[PDB]
Amino acid sequence: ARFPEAEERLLNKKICMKCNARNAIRATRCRKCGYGTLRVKSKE
Amino acid sequence: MKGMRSNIPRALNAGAQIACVDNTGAKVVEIISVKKYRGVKNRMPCAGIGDMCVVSVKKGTPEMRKQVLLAVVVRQKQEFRRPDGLHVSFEDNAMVITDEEGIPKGTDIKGPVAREVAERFPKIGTTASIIV
Amino acid sequence: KPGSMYRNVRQRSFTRRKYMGGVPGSQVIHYDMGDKANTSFPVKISLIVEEKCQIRHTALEAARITANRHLVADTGKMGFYMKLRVYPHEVIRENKSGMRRAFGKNVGTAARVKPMQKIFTVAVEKQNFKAAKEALWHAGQKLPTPCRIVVDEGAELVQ
Amino acid sequence: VIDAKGLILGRLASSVAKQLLSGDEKVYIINAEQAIISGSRAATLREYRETRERGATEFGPYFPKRPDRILKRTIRGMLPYKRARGRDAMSRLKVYVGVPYELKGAETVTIPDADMRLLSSSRYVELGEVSQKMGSKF
Amino acid sequence: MVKEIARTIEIPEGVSVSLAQDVFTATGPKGTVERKLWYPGIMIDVKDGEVVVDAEYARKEQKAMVGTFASHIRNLVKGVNEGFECKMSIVYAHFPMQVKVDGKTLIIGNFLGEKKPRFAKIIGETKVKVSGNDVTITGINKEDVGQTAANIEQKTKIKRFDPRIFQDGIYIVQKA
RNA sequence: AGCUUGUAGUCCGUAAGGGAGACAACCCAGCCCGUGGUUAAGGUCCCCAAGUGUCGACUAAGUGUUAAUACUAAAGGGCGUCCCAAGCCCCAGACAGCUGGAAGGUUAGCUUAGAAGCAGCUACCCUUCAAAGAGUGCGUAACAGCUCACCAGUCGAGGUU
RNA sequence: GCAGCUUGCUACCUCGAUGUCGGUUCUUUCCAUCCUGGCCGUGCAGCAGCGGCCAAGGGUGAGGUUGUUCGCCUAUUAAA
Ligand SMILES: [Mg+2]
Ligand SMILES: [Mg+2]
Ligand SMILES: [Zn+2]
């Protein structure tokens, strides 16, 4: 079930592309390894 | 599986030859392994009453001979005790060819079978005639 | 063989063709890249070396290929002029018994270098300077020595 | 008597060891459970855990758990305890957790060197915390 | 220009601030709050409706710490003056939920077919109120209300399925 | 390769005594016996003789606390922190936010119905006003608005490569 | 680049002797994790998969050929 708040606080985050750690949105640097490139958490 | 009221020693041993007591078409079988048994080092797998184990047909009709199948033990010569205090024993070991669930391929069983397999596997209970 | 097997300079040079025998060929096909007929690029940067070593020809070929791909993809086919400089004149030999008559036999070719000696050189316009730096940084990644980038001509333009 | 309230561990131990070796009456360290050990939390805990579980049962190193035992062991290393001089020195040291009844109200002094006020940052742990992390009821 | 490392806070009327020993104490119409803000190289003074905080060295660590302490002081005075609120919301597909306040905990019953109800702790005096599909969380301590909301959100997370298809629990529609 | 084979000097072999944790050949020193004195190498928190010495900075990792050395880890990266230089914008007002704007046309070329800024040619879609776009994304058959780029009012001191 | 768990290279110790390969019994150590515990991503609906991170407490068996280590095969097993 797709609801606004659930998607807001569940699948609205960026993912480090090396260690798979999830980060904030307005970021460009993994908080645990510092890798430059961050993708976005997969949608539907 | 579902627990039994009685306590059954594991008498028969992997390598034993049992006389199957149904009308499926086999006379003698060879216990290869016992379902749901881990074991420890140097210990041979062993089976008792109401234990599903894979066997091999040694004497019987040509089509059945050389076939790996499933079967359970219905009697054993090694004594075991009832819940309320008593020991029961038989003159000979026996086995019946069945499926994974418990439906026996034979529609007729010769001789008595222990009541505990009758409670664990109801189908063996119904297909039997005399229960002791 | 591994890269570090033939990378140090510990022994004399061994390059006279007429005395040794059976040197295998090379893979690097062209030593000039891009617009050769142009001579009006105001910026001329280059990749230099920080330490003496030996570079196999295969490493040079890989670096050239990667720099070519990057530069053509971003700057354009007519917007640069790359030129490799060092040619492999040395010869590499690999023993192949034990230590009995351990002298080796020719297996490849290598190009010795010297500290602060230019290897590559790229000329571009003013608008494609960052692409030139980006291209030259990947090429030095395949190279067996630490490498730094120096902007030789038009330093005031870019800086 | 010496009050170990807020003193560096090694500094205190070095001063006490030297002035035991010089030869005098015996010395008493009280409140030997809030002495300071400068350093980050995780590193201190890791090093003390490795020190604790290091021996063999018959003859291996038996590192103590109690806080005063740890302080005594720390002073024991700055001292020739195998010689006669060192053994005599070790016979005149008494470190107590809390305040023993007989030393109650006794006149105190401190080592002005080993002071936590003389530390740049707030990166330190107290000895009782390590004692309780090692599993000791004191 | 200058990299001066001083900060002012301009305390408002009502709050009786103090810096006895190290703990920083305030009191006002919305109860009282306490905190300790000791750190070497960073001195704080309270005087005339404002607390001045500064350092001595221009190292970036000192500057970060002075910013952090100024922010904490502002949040403390703001909390004691009026208070802080956090709003959340409930969502479910098939299994209705029984959010019930009992003691110092919030019990979540019947979460995704749940016989053992989950437990969420309440920190401090953070009074919470349940009303339909939303939860309001009052308080005077900012960290307290934040941590209470975080616990409530973290207890109700289903951790063996896909967020695309399962989305249930309590979510924060607006921070404190 | 603590491998093998050369060469100049000096050593061990055949070299005490002092210092390196112990150390054949590393540093000071080449040594008759006894007493006093001052130094070399090296050291001065305790073990251990003599500094919890002075001045100016750095490190937060127990990193390090290991002249040489057969005993000590590399390429690569770090908006970790401390410095130098060079450009660029700048209190008549730079950056991050608060804001809205992104209206003229268009629904771009598109056969599938439809990929109508986001499959596939093009070009700044306005003569014009800060803004106005062939245009990124939530949406998006196509779109559409929401609006990207891109400027404009707003704070009020340094910002940025 | 790491390890020294395969084979090489060297000849520093041992030829007035340091008793070889495999199996058996019994004890212990490492982690570079096969199962059991906890997490993250997915081209993860559920079941079951694929990839990675922490973790060495416990478990890791029975048989046919072969002297074999190694390896092939059989029926179980949470994994063998
Ligand atoms: Mg000599
Ligand atoms: Mg000597
Ligand atoms: Zn990462």
Check if the beta carbon of residue D64 is closer than 8 Å to that of residue D130: no
Interatomic CA distance for residues B84 and B6, integer angstroms: 9
Chain F: bases < 7 Å from a protein Cβ: 1, 45-48, 52, 58-62, 75-82, 86-87, 91, 138-139, 157-158
| DSSP classification of residue E94 | S
Write b or e for each residue in D23-34: b if 16 or more Cβ atoms lie within 10 A of its Cβ, otherwise e. eeeebbbbbbbe
Ligand 1 center to D73 CA (angstroms): 49
Q: How far apart are CA A23 and CA A16, in angstroms?
A: 7
**How many whole angstroms separate alpha carbon C5 and alpha carbon C24?**
18
CB–CB contact A6 E173 (8 Å)? no
Distance CA C137, CA C146 (A): 11
Between A1, A5, A7, which is nearest E89 by CB?
A: A5
Length of chain A: 44
C-alpha span between D50 and C121 (Å, rounded): 56
State which residues between 133 and 162 of chain E bring their CB within 7 Å of strand G: 159-162
Alpha-carbon dihedral sign for residues E139, E142, E146, E147: negative
Helix (H, G, I), strand (E, B) or coil at D94: strand
Instruction: Report the DSSP pairing between strands B52-60 and B68-75.
Output: antiparallel
Biggest CA-to-CA distance, chain B:
46
Residue-by-residue DSSP string for chain C: --GGGG----S-----TTTS----------SB-S-SS----SEEEEEEESS--EEEHHHHHHHHHHHHHHHHHHT-SSS---B------EEEEE---TTTT---EEEEEEEE--TT-EEEEEEE-STTHHHHHHHHHHHGGGSSS-EEEEEEE-HHHH-
CB contact under 8 A, A6 and E165: no
Give dist(CA B130, CA B118) in Å, integer: 11
Q: How would you label B69-99 residue by residue, b for 16+ Cβ within 10 Å and e otherwise?
A: bbbbbbbbeeebeeeeeeebebeebbbbbbe
B21: number of Cβ within 10 Å: 22
Distances (CA, A) of E8 to B58, E55, E72, E73: 97, 13, 12, 10
Measured CA to CA, the distance from residue E37 to residue E53 in angstroms comes to 11
Backbone angles phi, psi at D86, to 5 degrees: -65, -40
Hey, are the CB atoms on E167 and A8 less than 8 Å from each other?
no
Determine the 3-state secondary structure of E149 from DSSP.
Answer: helix
Q: Which two tokens stand for residue E143?
A: 């960290």
Please list every residue in chain E whose beta carbon sits closer than 8 Å to the beta carbon of residue A1: 91, 93, 165-167
Cα torsion angle, D74, D77, D80, D83, sign: positive
In terms of Cβ atoms closer than 10 Å to its own Cβ (0-12, 13-18, 19+), residue C123 is: buried
Instruction: State both tokens at D15.
Output: 């001063």
Entry field: residues in chain D: 138
User: What is the rounded CA–CA span in Å between residue E41 and residue E66?
Assistant: 10
Contacts of A8 in chain E (CB under 8 A): 171
Rounded to 10 degrees, what is the CA torsion of C143, C144, C148, C149? Answer: -20
Element (H, E) at D128: helix D127-133
- Alpha-carbon distance values, B122 to B21, B53, B94, B96, D111 (Å): 17, 18, 18, 14, 86
Q: What are phi and psi of C118, to 5 degrees?
A: -70, 140
Distance between CA atoms of residues D92 and D14, nearest Å: 15
E120 CA to F101 C1' distance (Å): 47
**What distance in Å separates the CA atoms of residue C134 and residue C114, rounded to the nearest whole number?**
24
* Structure token pair of residue D101: 């009844």
Q: How far apart are CA D10 and CA D35, in angstroms?
A: 10
| Residues 18-37 on chain A lying near strand F, CB distance under 7 A | 28-29, 34, 36
Residue D113: CB less than 7 A from any atom in strand F = yes
Helix, strand, coil tally for chain E in percent (to 5): 20, 30, 50
Name every residue whose Cβ is closer than 8 Å to that of residue C143 and which is 6 or more positions away in sequence.
C55, C59, C63, C119
Residues of chain D neighbouring E38 (CB-CB closer than 8 A): 122
Q: Is E163 touching D (CB cutoff 8 A)?
A: no
Q: If you measure CA to C1', which residue is closest to nucleotide F3?
A: C99
Chains touching chain A through at least 3 C-beta pairs below 8 angstroms are E
Please give the distance, rounded to the nearest whole angstrom, from the Cα atom of residue D77 to the centre of ligand 2. Answer: 30
Find tokens 């036999």 and name the residue: C105
- Report the residue of D116, D122, D123, D124 to disrupt the E interface, i.e. the one with the largest count of E CBs within 10 Å: D122
User: How many of the other CB atoms lie within 10 Å of CB of E55?
Assistant: 21
Q: What angle do CA E57, E58, E61 make, to 5 degrees?
A: 90
DSSP track, B81-109: E-TTS-EE--SS-EEEEE-SSS-BS-S-B
- Burial (CB count within 10 angstroms: exposed 0-12, middle 13-18, buried 19+), residue B100: exposed
Distance from CA of D96 to the nearest CA of E (A): 29
Ligand lying nearest the CA atom of residue A22: 3
Contacts of A44 in chain E (CB under 8 A): 164
Q: Is the CB of A35 under 7 A from strand G?
A: no
Which residues in 51-70 of chain B line strand G, with CB less than 7 A from it?
A: 54, 68
Query: Is residue D106 helix, strand or coil?
Result: coil
Alpha helices in D24-119 (DSSP H): 41-52, 67-77, 84-90
> Does any CB of chain A come closer than 8 Å to the CB of residue E158?
no
Rounded CA gap, C121 and C44, in Å?
7
Q: CA distances (Å), E95 to each of C140, C149, E90, E154, in order?
A: 61, 64, 12, 19
Burial zone of C85 (CB within 10 Å; 0-12 exposed, 13-18 middle, 19+ buried): middle
**In whole angstroms, what is the distance from residue C63 CA to residue C143 CA?**
7
CA atoms within 13 A on the CB side of B31: 28
Q: Name the closest residue on chain E to residue D119, using Cα atoms.
A: E40
Q: Which chain D residue's Cα is nearest to E42?
A: D121
The protein residue nearest G41 (Cα–C1') is: A20
Structure tokens at C32: 């000039």
The CA-based angle D37-D42-D45, given to 5 degrees, is 60
Q: In Å, how far is D121's CA from the nearest CA of chain E?
A: 6
Is D76 (CB) below 7 Å from strand F? no
Distance CA E138, CA E123 (A): 12
- State the distance from the centre of ligand 1 to the C-alpha of A44, rounded, in angstroms: 86
Distance, in Å, from the CA atom of C62 to the CA atom of C139, rounded to the nearest integer, reads 8
Burial class (CB in 10 A: 0-12, 13-18, 19+), E96: exposed
H helix or E strand, kind and range, residue E55: strand E51-55
A to E CB pairs, distance under 8 Å: 29
Q: Which of B34, B29, B25, B18 is nearest to B57 (CA)?
A: B29
Q: Give the Cα separation of C78 and E160 in Å (integer).
A: 56
Which run of H or of E encompasses D20? helix D9-21
Residue type, A17: M
Backbone angles phi, psi at D22, to 5 degrees: -60, -25
- What experimental approach yielded this model? cryo-EM
Phi-psi region of C36 (alpha: psi -120 to 50; beta: other; left: phi over 0): alpha
Alpha-carbon separation of residue C36 from C124, C130, E32, E56 (angstroms): 12, 21, 80, 61
Contact partners for chain C, using 3 or more CB pairs closer than 8 A, are none
Helix, strand, coil share of chain D (percent; to 5): 40, 15, 50
